[PDB]
Amino acid sequence: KIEELLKKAKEMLKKYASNIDKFIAALRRVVQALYDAGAYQVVIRMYQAALAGQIDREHLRFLIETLQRIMANAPSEMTRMAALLLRLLALLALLTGDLLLVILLAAMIILLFAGYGEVVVKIFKIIREMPDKEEALKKAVELAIKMVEEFRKK
Amino acid sequence: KIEELLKKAKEMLKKYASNIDKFIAALRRVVQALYDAGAYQVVIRMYQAALAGQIDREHLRFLIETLQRIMANAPSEMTRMAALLLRLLALLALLTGDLLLVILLAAMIILLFAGYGEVVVKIFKIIREMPDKEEALKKAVELAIKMVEEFRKKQGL
Amino acid sequence: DEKKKIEELLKKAKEMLKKYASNIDKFIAALRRVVQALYDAGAYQVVIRMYQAALAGQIDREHLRFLIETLQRIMANAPSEMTRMAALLLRLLALLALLTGDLLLVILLAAMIILLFAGYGEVVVKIFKIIREMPDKEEALKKAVELAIKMVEEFRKKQGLE
Amino acid sequence: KKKIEELLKKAKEMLKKYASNIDKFIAALRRVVQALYDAGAYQVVIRMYQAALAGQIDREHLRFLIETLQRIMANAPSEMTRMAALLLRLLALLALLTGDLLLVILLAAMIILLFAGYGEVVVKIFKIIREMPDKEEALKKAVELAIKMVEEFRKKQGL
Amino acid sequence: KKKIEELLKKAKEMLKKYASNIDKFIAALRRVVQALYDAGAYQVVIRMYQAALAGQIDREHLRFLIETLQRIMANAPSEMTRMAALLLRLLALLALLTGDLLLVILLAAMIILLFAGYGEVVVKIFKIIREMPDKEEALKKAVELAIKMVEEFRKK
């Protein structure tokens, strides 16, 4: 399953690359829907627990199911695909138990909610251009954590 | 299964009856733990959706597992058992599909958060003293909804 | 190699239970001495918290690791071989609980510690009887865990856990 | 290696955050200590303290405290509590990696005094550790005051 | 020379603590001696006792007892046991720093008598050391009583 999820994730990132701005907008709408569903503080708790080495699996499952409802009711294809990408990342974080993916997902949600689109485009640039995916993942997680700290400052 | 959950729930309510004040305090602590876990807005959304005839099962499942974690890490027996009572009610709502159970659970959590303990004592009195349990559930849900409206009027929700 | 460790830990346990069968009363006494050392080391409240968390479906691995290391210190400083080997048996069970993630092993370990502390030696003898006689070991574990939980509840009612 | 230096750097920055608001940080430390007690770690702290007073470092005790404090950081809703827990965890990690008994004694005595309600003693310990020029002599003086107050608390009530 | 004074004052305050409850302090001393035996130090104590009876001070034996008693203090859960160990450790350090054979004999003989169950002899030793005005003559009398009762124990 992990192999299938990784294949679909990168295939979704090729659609992202084709048109960044509309995909970022769709991610923002998905994050707004998550907030409307009552899941934002769930994301914040998941992020804090992950920063300290704890993976909140119930939080991940609730996020996955909420994203699936969003895909079911979204009229825009762009919104469905943004939701699908975030859901694939969440399922990967859940099944691999990898803390950096939990941090990446939660920080991406937080930064999208905060309006830091440039940080998300750069994170995706790190994930798609650098070949060493593990160190690209570490670099993007480092930038995400740094920028959420900056958002937390103001 | 539903029969066994009902058995443990009412047996838990007799333990409640033995000492109402400390049990309400423990329920307040459980709800504070729910809020700290990020689950309070989950309950509010579940409550609105139930008021409109929709059962948000992902919300219920997240609440159930959060209550289980609270039971796993609570040092007080009172806190563990209050959490267990709320979790049994949630499991009943999930397996029976009863919208009134979802409304009751969410409204009890909200009123506990609001400090309306007296309303919670009255809800429990209605469901355990009235003989016809379905009519007690209907009446308690009506009182819960009314008092949640009052809490929304005076403070925020 | 992880499973390799699991068979080695279970097999090393089986030899300890045959030695136990040879002289149950003295082995129970050694278990009481090990548990008294655990209490003196400050690990009893750790065991109680682990027990409650396991009863609610959570495995506290830091608690298990602290118990494993404490039991190893007991083996290092115990002058009686009986004490060292009782500690070794409990440590093998703890390592098994830790590597398999089996909640029933965590509950059994913690309840055995609590019952030994409470003086319920015959309950521990019956637990070992279930684990040694019943053919289906997985069903023996469930039966022993339910008996342990029941008797820990009785002890909590009569005397108090902490 | 060079991690002890990073732990000292992060600790000193955490003590600057402490200095910014003393009272709320002491409150967060008491909340962290209450969480330790709820986790079953208080008797561990007392045993570590007694062993350290006689020159013995209980390393399993330290590791259990480090891991418990990290779980507290993972589940604390207030950032102030998370950062108090992180400060105590950095001190524990330093005690573990340097083998310094005075750090073990300081950590355990601070936990005991916070549990006992001697917050002002902790404020004084932090004042000594942050104001004196010679950090090692400040550590010795702070440990001296901590030991005095834990012994006095044992004289009045219990431990 | 100043350390000898600091050890002596800490000893006198420990003996006032003993006086407050002699029976419980003797029980704690027996527990300390049992811990020494479990640590493998009892034959060390016996050889130290013989060597001191013949005018030889075994300093490695004394140091091993000092460090073992401190380990006992580090791991004892009872405060009184930690303090009995501390009293014996102060006495051992005094024997080591002064080179006094009577302190070596007294320490080893008290350990032996506690192990043998002669608690009352140790109570009398403490009474002699705390009542007699001339402390050196009190030490001589306590050593004579200790040697006499250890020899009596060895005969039977």
According to DSSP, residue C159 is labeled T
Query: Rounded to an integer, what distance in angstroms lies between the CA atom of residue A137 and that of residue A153?
Result: 24
Q: Which residues of E touch C40 (CB under 8 A)?
A: 77
According to DSSP, residue B76 is labeled S
Angle, alpha carbons D65-D68-D71 (nearest 5°): 150
Query: Rounded to an integer, what distance in angstroms lies between the CA atom of residue D47 and that of residue C45?
Result: 13
Query: Rounded to an integer, what distance in angstroms lies between the CA atom of residue D18 and that of residue B132?
Result: 59
Residue E65: how many other CB atoms lie within 10 Å: 27
Q: Which residue has the tokens 């390799």?
A: C4
Q: Which helix (H) or strand (E) holds B116?
A: none
E131 min Cα distance to partner chain C (Å):
37
Nearest to D29 by CA among D144, D153, D113, D100: D113
Query: Rounded to an integer, what distance in angstroms lies between the CA atom of residue E50 and that of residue E45?
Result: 9
| All chains having 3 or more CB pairs closer than 8 angstroms to chain B | A, C, D
Q: Which residues of A touch B37 (CB under 8 A)?
A: 45
**Helix A77-96 vs helix A2-18: angle between axes, to the nearest 10 degrees?**
150
Query: Rounded to an integer, what distance in angstroms lies between the CA atom of residue A84 and that of residue A92?
Result: 12
For residue B66, which amino acid is it?
Answer: T
According to DSSP, residue C161 is labeled -
B65 min Cα distance to partner chain D (Å):
15
Residue D33: how many other CB atoms lie within 10 Å: 24
Q: Which residues of C touch E36 (CB under 8 A)?
A: none
Q: Indicate the Cα dihedral angle E9, E10, E15, E17, nearest 10°.
A: 130
Q: Where does residue B51 rank: exposed (0-12), middle (13-18), buried (19+ CB within 10 A)?
A: middle
Nearest to B84 by CA among B71, B66, B65: B71
Q: Which residues of C touch D63 (CB under 8 A)?
A: 62, 65-66, 69
Query: Rounded to an integer, what distance in angstroms lies between the CA atom of residue B82 and that of residue B15?
Result: 10
Six-digit token pair at A97? 């138990």
Reduce the DSSP state of residue E23 to 3 states and report it: helix
Is there a contact between C114 and C127 (Cβ–Cβ < 8 Å)? no
Number of C-alpha atoms within 13 angstroms, CB side, residue C12?
Answer: 17
Q: Indicate the Cα dihedral angle C23, C25, C26, C28, nearest 10°.
A: 120
Mutation target for C interface from D49, D61, D73, D96: give the one with most C CBs within 10 A. Answer: D61
Query: Rounded to an integer, what distance in angstroms lies between the CA atom of residue E85 and that of residue E76?
Result: 9
Query: Rounded to an integer, what distance in angstroms lies between the CA atom of residue E89 and that of residue E74?
Result: 13
Query: Rounded to an integer, what distance in angstroms lies between the CA atom of residue E147 and that of residue E108?
Result: 10
In Å, how far from its chain's centre is CA C63?
13
Query: Rounded to an integer, what distance in angstroms lies between the CA atom of residue B47 and that of residue B127?
Result: 19
Q: What is the CA radius of gyration of chain D?
A: 14
Cα-based distances in Å from A108 to A86, A126, C80, C151: 9, 13, 59, 50
Q: Indicate the Cα dihedral angle C22, C26, C31, C37, nearest 10°.
A: -140
Q: Indicate the Cα dihedral angle B47, B49, B53, B57, nearest 10°.
A: -90
Phi, psi of D3 (to 5 degrees): -80, -35
Cα-based distances in Å from A31 to A53, B34, E56, E149: 24, 22, 85, 87
Interface residues on C facing B, Cβ-Cβ cutoff 8 A: 49, 52-53, 56-58
Question: Which residue of chain D has the CA closest to C69?
Answer: D60
Q: Which helix (H) or strand (E) holds B131?
A: none
Q: Which residues of B touch D74 (CB under 8 A)?
A: none
Cα torsion C13, C15, C21, C26: sign = negative
Of the candidates A48, A51, A54, the beta carbon closest to that of D71 is on A54
Helices (H) and strands (E) in chain C, counts: 8, 0
Q: Which residues of D touch B36 (CB under 8 A)?
A: 77
Question: Which residue of chain D has the CA closest to B33?
Answer: D77
| All chains having 3 or more CB pairs closer than 8 angstroms to chain D | A, B, C, E
Length of chain C in residues, anyone?
162
Query: Rounded to an integer, what distance in angstroms lies between the CA atom of residue A63 and that of residue A55?
Result: 13
Angle, alpha carbons D121-D127-D130 (nearest 5°): 140
Six-digit token pair at E138? 């009190």
Tell me, yes or no, whether chains A and B touch by having 3 or more C-beta pairs under 8 A.
yes
Q: Counting one residue from B and one from C, how many pairs have CB atoms under 8 Å apart?
A: 14
Is there a contact between B78 and B22 (Cβ–Cβ < 8 Å)? yes
Phi, psi of B112 (to 5 degrees): -60, -45
What ranges make up the beta strands (E) of chain E?
A: none
Nearest to A113 by CA among A29, A20, A18: A29
E70 min Cα distance to partner chain D (Å):
6
Residues 6+ apart with CB under 8 A from A12: A81, A84, A85, A88
Phi, psi of B21 (to 5 degrees): -65, -50
Six-digit token pair at A151? 């958002």
According to DSSP, residue B132 is labeled S
Of the candidates D38, D75, D77, the beta carbon closest to that of B75 is on D38
According to DSSP, residue C135 is labeled S
Of the candidates C40, C77, C79, the beta carbon closest to that of E77 is on C40
Question: Which residue of chain C has the CA closest to E36?
Answer: C79
Tell me, yes or no, whether chains E and A touch by having 3 or more C-beta pairs under 8 A.
no
Is there a contact between C94 and C113 (Cβ–Cβ < 8 Å)? no
Length of chain A in residues, anyone?
154
Helices (H) and strands (E) in chain B, counts: 8, 0
Six-digit token pair at C128? 């070992």
Q: Do B41 and A40 touch (CB under 8 A)?
A: yes
Cα diameter, chain A: 41
Tell me, yes or no, whether chains D and C touch by having 3 or more C-beta pairs under 8 A.
yes
Query: Rounded to an integer, what distance in angstroms lies between the CA atom of residue A141 and that of residue A132?
Result: 14
Six-digit token pair at B89? 């009610």
